[PDB]
A and B are shown apart, each in its own frame.
Chain A
Amino acid sequence: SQRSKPASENVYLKLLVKLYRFLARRTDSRFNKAILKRLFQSKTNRPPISISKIAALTSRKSASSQNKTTVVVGTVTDDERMLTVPKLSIAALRFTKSARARILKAGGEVLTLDQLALRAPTGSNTVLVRGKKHA
């Protein structure tokens, strides 16, 4: 379920792979190559990331969150433990209904990977993140 093509049968994942196949081939961005590689991965190799972890990772140590978009090829779940959500711009394959509502109602924007490719076709000013693969 990797390497050449995705094993997934979703036609909309196949369209996203189509878009980033072109971007990874007709640009010199390692971001587009990295996104394409992760689009081929299985559900087990694309662990979800939480709203809390995105907020923590962006304002980490030196903080200086600014307005860089956060990209994760996977699901952005919600952390109900945290009470206040900052203003975040996140691009992800999927958002849960709780995560999407909390980002929008108090914060910024939720994007899909094709909306991100139009804003940052080279991936510039993006914070690409991963989930903890150790389950």
Chain B
Amino acid sequence: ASIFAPESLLKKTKAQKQSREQIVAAAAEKKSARQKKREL
């Protein structure tokens, strides 16, 4: 009755989740550096 998600989907989701974390982490830093650069 319950169809488990494919295991390749779980592996891709873990990889995509990690890549999104780096993008967001390097996006808040990008905003701060841009504000400091623009003042300079």
The answer to whether any beta carbons of A and B sit under 8 Å apart in the complex is: no
